[PDB]
Design a protein around this ligand. Structure first.
Ligand SMILES: CCCCCCCCCCCCCCCCCC(=O)OC[C@H](COP(=O)([O-])OCC(O)COP(=O)([O-])OC[C@@H](COC(=O)CCCCCCCCCCCCCCCCC)OC(=O)CCCCCCCCCCCCCCCCC)OC(=O)CCCCCCCCCCCCCCCCC
Ligand SMILES: CCCCCCCCCCCCCCCCCC(=O)OC[C@H](COP(=O)([O-])OCC(O)COP(=O)([O-])OC[C@@H](COC(=O)CCCCCCCCCCCCCCCCC)OC(=O)CCCCCCCCCCCCCCCCC)OC(=O)CCCCCCCCCCCCCCCCC
Ligand SMILES: CCCCCCCCCCCCCCCCCC(=O)OC[C@H](COP(=O)([O-])OCC(O)COP(=O)([O-])OC[C@@H](COC(=O)CCCCCCCCCCCCCCCCC)OC(=O)CCCCCCCCCCCCCCCCC)OC(=O)CCCCCCCCCCCCCCCCC
Ligand SMILES: CCCCCCCCCCCCCCCCCC(=O)OC[C@H](COP(=O)([O-])OCC(O)COP(=O)([O-])OC[C@@H](COC(=O)CCCCCCCCCCCCCCCCC)OC(=O)CCCCCCCCCCCCCCCCC)OC(=O)CCCCCCCCCCCCCCCCC
Ligand SMILES: CCCCCCCCCCCCCCCCCC(=O)OC[C@H](COP(=O)([O-])OCC(O)COP(=O)([O-])OC[C@@H](COC(=O)CCCCCCCCCCCCCCCCC)OC(=O)CCCCCCCCCCCCCCCCC)OC(=O)CCCCCCCCCCCCCCCCC
Ligand SMILES: CCCCCCCCCCCCCCCCCC(=O)OC[C@H](COP(=O)([O-])OCC[N+](C)(C)C)OC(=O)CCCCCCCCCCCCCCCCC
Ligand SMILES: CCCCCCCCCCCCCCCCCC(=O)OC[C@H](COP(=O)(O)OCCN)OC(=O)CCCCCCCCCCCCCCCCC
Lengths: 74, 62, 110, 59, 103, 93, 44, 196, 43
């Protein structure tokens, strides 16, 4: 059998762009900005929460037809 | 009528396959998984395999 | 977010006090707790007619209150030592070290 | 047109050390990869199972 | 196969071939496919990267191409650590606010 | 340098009116073998990647849930329900 | 790795011979995209 | 017209830059076989191949604004545009030949699956009529193609060596009885002697 | 010939493979429901 395992990068994808190295910083800036936005939203939603349980938290239920939900004691 | 010519006991595809394949397919599985699986299972049980009973198992209704 | 929201905001001091008192109570009054849980397990005792459990519940609560109110001087001293150790452990943002198990064992034996 | 036929070589060749030595390595790698993929599939399958239901329950 | 089923099968495969050919070679569809193929090629073979073949003498290689990896690592690590610190600050702020509001 | 003379000549001088008719049946057969090996082989891998997270991380796909409270209606033998919207969150770790 | 899996399937399965190098490349691109999506999503 | 300036600059840059590469890409495509003519570009190195394929359409279709072009620059752009159109036609020709090759290879693959040793479920002693007709018509088209390439000895030789290989394998897959003399009548003239 | 940041590429590929395998197989996050019958109890 032939040995083929290796961690080295393939030369097919190792080319540079004409003006220099590949667009690494430009894409990393976008990635960092997107991560900042996403994690900021997640943190804001997560931390500023409380559960308030009282009569005003309950409303009258209804069917998908909009009528009030009541089930008989059949 | 398909006529097959085959040396069952000496051809490379025969009893030699039974002797060879099982001991070579399970080389990496055994030698890697068994130590790895043992490590993964035991590292939790530094103190013991104790089930901290969150429900009253010893309590039986009168 | 998937983590449940909080209902009652406990101060860190209050949280540690209640936690230590709870650990003590599970030793002092496990009998009342077990009886209450047994009576609250059945359908009739849990949803339909919870009042049949009320008396048992009361007893349990009383026991817990008695634990929450450290009556013995030795109990108070041990609880204060354990609570101070817990506060120091919690406030330590630097790499944490020794545990507060010794003080807890001292308190549970009071 | 009667299609031609042949006698598969591996059915009529005396077993040799080269076949064994090379196919052993190939089977080692095949077993490793198959074991990994099958473990993944097994975890997926078992996690896909439903929860136990009551006795004589409809819906 | 039976020659009647042969007629049916030939007609069906001809219809499939014609449908595929029309859909691929229709003006707007052809333009869409032609642009999307190149977009896919750009994405797959020219994705952002940190390792690349250096064919230039040290005098003819920019500094950006010698410290891009370090800049990327700095950006990512700083983002992660700053998000962690922001999470801790938000935890403290929320705790203090809801404590001072009641209990 | 490789002696690509003949290939250079082939590239420079190629016919511009020669074409071959394609048997539709064989083209379709090959393409449907390709579809068979896509849907039924790579489809397994694609569906695993798409779904396995949805099996091991279900809570992130169902954000809002509903809760109910009930009261009796003795004089009509009915049951009255009050609904409530909640954020589907973990519970009893 | 992917290359090796494709090579084994091509060399052992007669039916798999039907696929062009272009179709293999399309599968390669789709698999890479799915792997990137999997890595990203698991952490979300 | 700023947008016109940018459009024309983009077109000029891409088209002229690729025109200097069209020779290399076309030569490489010729070098490989017809099974996967773009094999080298997919596996080893994409020497501005996908770029040529994409920008050929733009060269053919997108308009030009001569007032934004010089004299020698405009002549060079027209030359490059013609080169890209030539590449478009060359790619179309190679694609046609490659698809015909795959037709023949499909026929051969069906035969091989027929005679495969693992084929314990679909073993057929006698070739059926449908595949015989397919073989006959495919060989007829191949002979017509060889005739049509009489002015291009290199192309004719490549078409033989590449496509006729599977015709020869099909020839070898079956016995010389039944309709065999009629099916391979055209093949027996010259091609059969070549593949011996 | 020289490849910029080759070692970084090797380690990134290794990390990607490790993470993908970890999440796909969940090798580290086993299930212990099968061991519960074979475990002692407290309290
Ligand atoms: C961000 C949010 C918005 C995203 C919107 C995306 C929209 C995409 C629409 C695409 C439409 C079809 C396009 C057809 C091609 C037309 C353009 C063209 O031919 O190229 C011209 C131009 C030059 O091409 P070329 O001359 O042929 O050069 C190549 C040659 O080999 C010659 O090479 P060379 O050596 O001469 O060098 C030339 C160099 C020249 O290149 C450049 O100059 C470009 C450099 C980068 C941009 C620089 C400018 C930055 C500032 C822009 C500011 C814009 C402001 C806009 C304001 C708008 C206000 C309204 O070329 C390159 O290096 C090409 C770069 C290719 C980059 C590909 C990126 C792939 C990955 C993307 C996703 C990454 C996710 C990571 C997540 C990881 C998380 C862990 O290239 C480009 O325009 C590049 C575009 C690349 C991206 C297109 C595809 C994006 C798809 C994203 C994934 C979305 C998936 C969603 C699911 C799917 C269903 C929806
Ligand atoms: C020819 C006919 C053959 C017929 C065979 C019929 C077989 C029927 C099987 C029925 C199902 C058995 C399931 C066992 C589950 C075991 C785990 C378990 O208890 O989990 C609890 C399970 C929950 O699972 P979980 O915890 O979420 O995850 C389980 C995972 O396995 C993860 O758990 P873990 O993390 O603890 O995993 C342990 C770790 C352990 O891994 C290791 O460390 C590996 C160690 C290996 C050591 C081996 C040593 C051998 C020594 C060799 C020595 C050779 C010497 C030679 C010398 C030569 C001379 C020098 O990983 C593994 O166990 C690896 C598994 C992956 C397998 C990879 C290969 C898959 C493809 C190949 C399959 C076999 C093909 C054979 C073809 C034969 C052709 C002739 O829940 C239960 O309580 C279920 C209990 C099991 C019953 C399930 C019933 C389902 C019924 C479905 C309906 C249809 C049934 C159809 C039946 C048909 C019958 C004919
Ligand atoms: C529970 C969850 C759900 C599970 C099911 C999920 C299914 C997902 C979709 C699968 C889609 C598969 C089809 C698309 C892929 C490409 C197929 C293809 O090439 O198309 C043309 C090709 C036919 O080509 P052909 O020209 O007609 O054949 C002549 C060529 O020379 C032939 O040349 P060749 O080299 O191309 O042909 C080799 C051919 C293989 O085809 C053959 O040539 C022969 C196939 C039959 C072989 C039967 C065994 C022969 C004797 C061996 C010794 C057995 C000993 C057992 C007892 C041991 C006792 C100790 O290989 C394949 O089929 C490639 C893919 C195979 C794996 C994927 C399919 C797995 C199906 C598993 C369930 C099957 C149904 C239940 C069976 C059990 C019921 C109790 O395949 C087909 O059209 C048939 C497809 C397969 C049908 C099922 C046959 C049984 C397979 C059992 C495999 C078991 C593996 C172990 C793990 C199983 C875990 C579930
Ligand atoms: C849900 C999420 C969605 C978004 C994410 C998507 C992610 C997945 C990827 C999707 C990929 C597939 C996309 C769908 C296929 C679209 C096919 C198509 O366009 O069909 C046209 C195509 C007809 O065009 P044709 O046959 O190729 O051309 C001959 C015609 O006679 C026409 O001849 P003509 O000369 O009269 O007109 C030529 C030109 C109109 O000509 C003009 O007026 C000039 C256009 C711009 C030329 C390039 C100037 C670049 C200047 C530098 C910019 C630098 C920016 C900053 C960065 C600097 C540092 C690098 O019209 C086109 O052909 C437009 C094609 C699309 C844009 C091509 C330009 C690419 C480069 C510029 C954009 C990318 C940024 C590159 C930056 C870096 C550059 C180095 O076929 C159709 O008519 C099909 C219609 C039905 C299908 C849907 C049509 C959708 C139309 C969308 C228009 C979008 C315009 C751009 C918006 C930009 C917003 C920021
Ligand atoms: C219709 C169009 C056509 C559709 C076709 C169908 C398929 C879809 C196609 C769509 C097109 C895009 C497809 C995805 C890209 C595929 C790339 C590919 O296949 O490349 C293979 C190719 C394989 O090559 P290879 O030879 O095998 O080598 C690979 C090795 O891994 C070698 O890798 P490497 O070594 O070069 O590394 C790569 C590099 C890549 O990374 C980057 O540079 C990128 C960075 C992230 C940028 C993210 C930008 C995202 C922007 C998004 C903006 C919003 C978009 C919204 C769009 C909406 C719609 C318009 O990695 C790094 O930079 C490593 C960073 C590690 C950081 C470590 C942190 C350390 C912290 C500690 C610091 C030190 C502390 C010391 C303390 C000491 C205490 C004592 O990959 C590459 O070579 C490129 C690198 C890999 C890039 C992966 C990018 C994946 C992006 C997925 C995006 C999915 C978006 C879905 C959106 C859905 C919306 C609904
Ligand atoms: C849920 C479903 C599970 C079902 C499990 C089924 C398991 C199937 C395991 C199959 C193993 C591999 C062989 C079949 C597939 C081969 C695919 C392939 O590429 O091969 C092509 C090749 C054959 O094709 P070829 O050799 O012509 O090669 C192709 C060449 N050209 C292209 C020129 C045509 O290999 C084979 O098919 C070899 C077949 C060997 C068969 C060996 C049979 C052994 C039987 C042992 C029985 C033991 C009984 C013991 C009883 C004891 C009682 C006490
Ligand atoms: C090596 C190459 C091949 C590799 C292949 C790899 C495949 C990867 C597949 C990935 C996707 C995995 C999907 C898993 C779905 C499993 C569904 C299943 O059958 O689960 C078992 C299920 C009962 O499970 P459950 O209801 O949860 O009850 C137990 C709860 N404790 O069982 C049931 O409910 C039983 C009814 C459903 C199942 C019906 C199956 C019908 C099969 C018909 C076969 C027809 C062909 C026959 C051929 C031979 C003919 C002679």
């Amino acid at each position: 059998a032939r040995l083929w395992w290796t961690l080295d990068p393939s030369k097919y994808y190792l080319k540079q762009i004409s003006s220099g190295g590949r667009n690494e910083i430009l894409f990393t800036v976008l990635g960092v900005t997107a991560a900042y936005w996403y994690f900021g939203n997640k943190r804001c939603e997560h931390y500023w929460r409380r559960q308030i349980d009282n009569c005003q938290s309950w409303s009258r239920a209804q069917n998908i037809n909009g009528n009030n939900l009541t089930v008989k004691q059949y | 009528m398909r006529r097959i010519f085959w040396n069952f006991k000496t051809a490379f595809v025969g009893l030699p396959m039974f002797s060879l394949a099982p001991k070579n397919i399970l080389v990496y599985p055994i030698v890697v998984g068994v130590p790895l699986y043992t490590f993964i299972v035991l590292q939790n049980s530094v103190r013991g395999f104790a089930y901290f009973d969150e429900y009253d198992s010893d309590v039986k209704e009168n | 977010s998937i983590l449940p929201p909080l209902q009652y905001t406990y101060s860190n001091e209050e949280s540690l006090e209640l936690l230590i008192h709870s650990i003590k109570g599970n030793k002092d009054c496990n009998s009342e707790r077990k009886a209450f849980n047994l009576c609250r397990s059945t359908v009739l005792g849990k949803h339909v007619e919870p009042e049949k459990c009320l008396d048992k519940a009361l007893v349990f609560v009383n026991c817990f209150q008695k634990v929450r109110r450290d009556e013995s001087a030795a109990c108070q001293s041990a609880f204060n030592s354990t609570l101070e150790c817990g506060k120091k452990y919690s406030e330590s943002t630097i790499s944490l070290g020794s545990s507060c198990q010794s003080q807890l064992d001292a308190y549970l034996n009071c | 047109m009667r299609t031609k036929l042949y006698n598969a070589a591996y059915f009529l060749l005396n077993n040799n050390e080269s076949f064994g030595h090379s196919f052993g390595i190939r089977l080692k790698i095949v077993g490793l990869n198959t074991w990994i993929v099958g473990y993944a599939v097994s975890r997926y399958y078992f996690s896909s199972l439903r929860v136990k239901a009551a006795q004589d329950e409809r819906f | 196969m039976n020659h009647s089923c042969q007629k049916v099968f030939e007609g069906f495969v001809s219809a499939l071939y014609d449908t595929s050919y029309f859909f691929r070679n229709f003006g707007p569809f052809k333009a869409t496919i032609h642009y999307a193929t190149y977009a896919n090629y750009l994405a797959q073979n020219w994705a952002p990267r940190v390792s690349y073949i250096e064919t230039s003498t040290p005098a003819y290689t920019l500094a950006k191409n010698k410290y891009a990896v370090y800049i990327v690592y700095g950006l990512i690590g700083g983002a992660l650590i700053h998000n962690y610190m922001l999470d801790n600050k938000a935890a403290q702020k929320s705790q203090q606010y809801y404590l001072k509001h009641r209990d | 340098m490789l002696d690509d003379t003949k290939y250079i000549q082939m590239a420079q001088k190629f016919p511009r009116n020669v074409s071959v008719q394609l048997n539709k049946k064989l083209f379709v057969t090959r393409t449907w073998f390709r579809n068979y090996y896509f849907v039924g082989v790579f489809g397994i891998f694609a569906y695993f990647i798409y779904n396995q997270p949805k099996i091991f991380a279900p809570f992130s796909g169902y954000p809002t849930t509903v809760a109910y409270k009930a009261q009796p209606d003795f004089l009509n033998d009915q049951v009255i329900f009050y609904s409530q919207q909640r954020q589907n969150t973990l519970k009893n770790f | 790795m992917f290359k090796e899996l494709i090579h084994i399937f091509r060399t052992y399965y007669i039916t798999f011979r039907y696929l062009k190098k272009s179709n293999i490349n399309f599968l390669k691109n789709l698999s890479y995209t799915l792997i990137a999506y999997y890595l990203i999503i698991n952490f979300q | 017209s700023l947008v016109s300036l940018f459009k024309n600059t983009f077109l000029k840059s891409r088209v002229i830059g690729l025109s200097f590469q069209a020779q290399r890409v076309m030569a490489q495509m010729a070098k490989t076989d017809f099974e996967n003519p773009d094999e080298h570009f997919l596996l080893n190195d994409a020497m501005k191949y996908n770029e040529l394929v994409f920008y050929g359409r733009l060269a053919e279709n997108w308009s030009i604004n001569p007032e934004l072009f010089g004299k020698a620059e405009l002549a060079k752009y027209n030359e490059a545009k013609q080169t890209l159109i030539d590449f478009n036609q060359y790619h179309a020709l190679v694609q046609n030949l490659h698809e015909f090759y795959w037709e023949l290879k499909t026929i051969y693959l069906e035969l091989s699956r027929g005679v495969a040793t693992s084929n314990f479920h679909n073993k057929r002693e006698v070739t059926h009529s449908i595949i015989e007709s397919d073989i006959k018509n495919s060989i007829h088209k191949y002979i017509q193609l060889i005739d049509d390439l009489k002015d291009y000895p290199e192309w004719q030789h490549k078409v033989r060596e590449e496509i006729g290989y599977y015709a020869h394998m099909i020839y070898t897959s079956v016995n010389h009885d039944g309709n065999f003399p009629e099916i391979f009548k055209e093949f027996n003239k010259v091609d059969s002697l070549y593949y011996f | 010939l020289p490849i910029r940041n080759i070692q970084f590429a090797r380690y990134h590929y290794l990390a990607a493979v490790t993470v993908f395998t970890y999440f796909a197989t969940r090798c580290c996050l086993l299930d212990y429901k099968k061991y519960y019958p074979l475990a002692s109890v407290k309290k």
